[PDB]
Symmetry: T
Subunit: 144 residues, 12 copies
């Protein structure tokens, strides 16, 4: 895909992941409620920020960001979670895999943008890689 | 509808309106760009906050908030805007009508919750009414 | 009176009371100067804030707030004080009675607005009642 | 009971619950020490704030708040806990039930005050209901 | 006029101009609503601050500041505006002329106070001149 | 008494004195209302902080702080005040004597802890002595 | 006197007045202790700031500020107060007269500096006049 | 050009553009005065910051930054604007073209520095590209 | 010269002096590097602020501030420094003389503006005199 | 040992314990990752601060603090941990024992310094005792 | 001497040392002007704070602090410096010796107060010892 | 070396350099004490931060950071300084060479990580290069 296409598919993923973790946040139960409730809040707010950042990047490239939730559902690589009951460990296992997916895509974003000479998208992509790698490391350690 | 049902339909409206104004924000053009760009940012962030507030309210009542974007599209009373080109005046005219819709619904929320003896949802609903009435007044004055 | 009429008469009272306490502030003498000088500053600034709040409320209802000081003098229930010399105790006795008047009127505002289904003016009115009741309690205790 | 009587019994409950959770705070042991130690600090400080708020409300109504700890023990509906050893889960189970008791009483406070036309106590009571409902929801989720 | 007399007439102008711009603020309509609404807020708050400053100056000179709104209407050189409908350009044109009037008067204040050896009123007057000259320059540029 | 016993009796005094001054705070009347109302707020908040500090100290020594208000009433050296009406001078006279009592006890706390080699309780005790001596000096000067 | 000589005599007065009010501060007794204790703190800190300001002004003119307390006692127009017991009213009466003295001297400072074309000392002097006139007005009102 | 030469020519452009927009800032007239006046302030301050940043970069490379305004005029690619009267739209059109020029040059800076293995200048250059691309996007949207 | 002409020549000096000290800042060497590097930063930022202040003053008088760097070089009384190597002492000696020049000119500005009845430029000029006199005093002391 | 010798051995312990807990911090795994990761960060930063404090104390006594890591390893009483895998409970058990060691040593520091009349080291030592006793109490409670 | 007598002699020293270093501050010349000018400001402000602290301590003990500068000159152990010209090194050498004197006296203060059982003066004295020892160490290192 | 190996050797250097500059900090003497004392504090805190940053980077790559000070001494390229006496110039000369070493290594880190496609370590490395180049430039200028 071209840079702007990778960006638009990521923007779709971001809002879908926002919604998914928003769902986790309100439906988490058990002895680790307070840590997971707080963590999921930070995680979905991060996806919301990513949604905004990606839109900004698409616009600056001269293209239209996502127009509708319908378009987000069309472009997303992320499956919608319909469950309302889950274990806290499974939540973090799920989020971890979503992080690993995003990491793969941002690496591709970085490589594709560099080939096009899009220096600004490279910077953005590599900065997101840094944030993702920290998040992945912590979740992996927690689940170890 | 029962209180929690009104709340869930509002939560659906909130995210759909977030997306709609997010679209306006990135696609606004013309001599009033800077004022409308800034205003639309504040407006969609307000809808995002409403989304969170409504979810909180639904959860505290012992029900599940929206689980997916699919469910949001199912429950919403708001039509998705597919356009990417518009005049700044039309943006504010659209948002005004959306505000008027939300005002009607929050009034119903307030009345229904009071009848059920749900004092906390009444407070929340009336506070949202206050915010909506200010927003409506300003947009009406601007378009006058 | 209708809600907006009660509001406009209150707005008139607010500016007249602002002026009255502004006069007290600059003309207070005696051993309790520093406490009364400071208290009267806080009191007239409170009336100034009320003036603004009431104007906002009238405008949002689709009516015109006070246009002139002439109109304020016409609508006010508060007598203008022409004196420049007084005792600090008499100042607080006067202000107390003005507070009691405002309390009566805001109670009426709350009841009238509720009957009209004006939920936002009810909230505003009850919040002002809270502030007035605290002020009344302190002045009563001071004069006891 | 009249409004001021409900308020005085609540003020008694507040200080007794402050003491109870203060005891929990200093005597909690085990792997969840740090979360429960911190949570119990926030909880007893909340009861201390409630004690102050209720006193303020009683005074403004023209009555005397609690004068002594003896009077608090006389009026309280809350049993004093003499234990110094407990499990962290039992602490939260206890606090939950105390919250549910307070919720019942504040609902009664709200209804009784409204019938008397005491608009300010209604506002206070409904605001406390909001805080209690959030606390109850979180504890219920944690214990689920 | 003597210094204190110029000051008292200015104090009268300040509150009358406060009221006038307060009226503009709530009644402004049209595409430049948000800029004019905000500007008029800053302008009337400036007149309110001037009212306070002038009162302080009169008191420190051993005289009584304005006692009533009646006295303000008697002493003012500013005509009360009864209109509730106007164009945003006309608002700024009006305010500009009011600024030019105030500038003339503060220049006289400065000259008269210097002749009397009132060094403190000179400083105050010249500082107000600075603020007025900035405001005039901006309004003139806007209307050019 | 041993260190922890002195500490527990002080903790009992702290909450009883909190309650006593809380009572003074809400029931003070007269021309010095505002100064005494504010002073009594600071004083009872100081006793509340002392209650917390003493509990912390007892716990760190490996003992249980006060468990109940019943236990506080058993251990206290302070008489409960049942009055609701008093003069502001008598309030400060009472508090002064309570301060002098606390000063005696903290001196004993310091001496006893030093003999036991409890260096941390010595530091705490001497710091409280400093705070008490300032408070005593001011009240003595006020009543002189 | 020349400008720098007026400044040096003022610097001497400032430290002597600092000491005088420092003495008042620590020795004030009676029912108005807390207000006078606080006021005297602000007053002596003001004289300390004046001491620094005057030194700065003398240095910038190419002269040496006060070198010793001996030199301050030599140059001062202010009598040292040896008393340790006084009434709070007498304190404010004394300070008032000291303010009136400083006012006379700063007026002379302003006039002398202007004649020499020392524009910076004029600004400083007139600013100090403003501060003195406010202080005088408040003390006069308090003693009225 | 070598890296340091590109940097020095950019530093020259920065100060010339600072001056140009400084001129626009003070000479802008018309109904959009307040937005353009504010925007031009932010724009020239940005060029001033760029001037400083570029100087820092040149120095760290072991070369001398611009020594004089004469040298800036010699090295600049930007034409000096002698006009004092213009339309607000033309101002933004001009600035846009200047931004596009700077964008071209910073891209070259980034490429040249990378070829030399100057990793720090690459980072700086790409960061400036990001800022320029945002500015260009907004001006383009405004003029669309 | 007329006031606005003195101001425009000063504005020219300000930017030329900014550039001169900017050059010193980046080229200073030796054991006092860190103090001189920091001092020169503060000094050139001061000249930059003066440039802005003078422009503001010229505009408010109804004239055009400097339009170009060419015009600055034409109007300046300050010689451009082409050197890149110097001793830190010589830097401060140079800056001192530039300060003394500015002091002479601002004194003339103050006198000329007063004769014209331009009270606002007098205030500005005298305030700048104060800042210059402090700077001169410190540099003189350092070089003594 | 003399005071300075106890201090130098403590400084050695501090850096060795810093390193040990730094190792724990990065290698902690499991369901309590986030609490232990955060706690270990605070703990090693505390040891780093202690390292600095002890160095300061040694220097002020006229001796040289630790010069090298070699010297730290020579003087330390703490065994280096070579493991990279451990349970979170064992981490806290280890740290607890290290705290108990430090407590013993700081008690000796306090006693030895007092005998020498080193009042400042006594204060420092007793303050560290306070911090250690809190830390010990919390870890003991957590492991209970 | 008794505790209060040591304190009063120290209070005398504090103001005399304030004056001495105030003199140094304004009369320092040479290449190290900026460091010594700043250091002497911090030093004399420290002596001013000590003056206040000592007065507080004397008052709390039931005695009168210094009443006059005459009494300060009578009680002081510090010789007044009449010089206006000195080297920066000599300034620090002088201050060092003054610090060493204060250190001796505060050690005596600590010992004497402990013998009297004055725990609060011991704490104060030892805290001042800490501050003095840091200051001495830095000056000694600077002069080494 | 592989990326993680370069990182681990750098982490070893960081703590060894921390210790070295910590030693300089406490043992610096002479007329430039205050500047060098402060500079060395900032420098060793920078090395401490680098130690933490490098550990984070190693962990995120799935490897173990330094476990012990023994391992740091094994891996370090930096010679331990045993001296306690030195000239301030020699300190900065030493630190400069250490900076130049770190610069070489971070350049290698950047190149090696890029070849491996480790985009996050490249960003980190280049950011550290920027910080090092600034530090080197300042030290070189100071020693010139």
């Amino acid at each position: 895909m071209k840079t702007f296409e990778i960006l638009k598919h990521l923007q779709a993923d971001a809002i879908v992941l926002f919604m998914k973790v928003h769902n986790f946040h309100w439906n988490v139960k058990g002895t680790d409620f307070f840590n997971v409730h707080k963590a999921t809040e930070e995680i979905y707010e991060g996806f919301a920020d990513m949604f905004d950042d990606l839109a900004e990047r698409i616009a600056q490239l001269g293209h239209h960001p996502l127009v509708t939730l319908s378009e987000a559902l069309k472009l997303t690589r992320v499956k919608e979670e319909t469950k309302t009951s889950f274990h806290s460990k499974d939540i973090f296992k799920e989020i971890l895999e979503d992080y690993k997916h995003l990491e793969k895509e941002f690496k591709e974003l970085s490589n594709t943008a560099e080939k096009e000479g899009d220096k600004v998208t490279v910077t953005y992509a590599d900065d997101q890689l840094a944030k993702l790698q920290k998040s992945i490391w912590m979740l992996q350690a927690h689940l170890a």
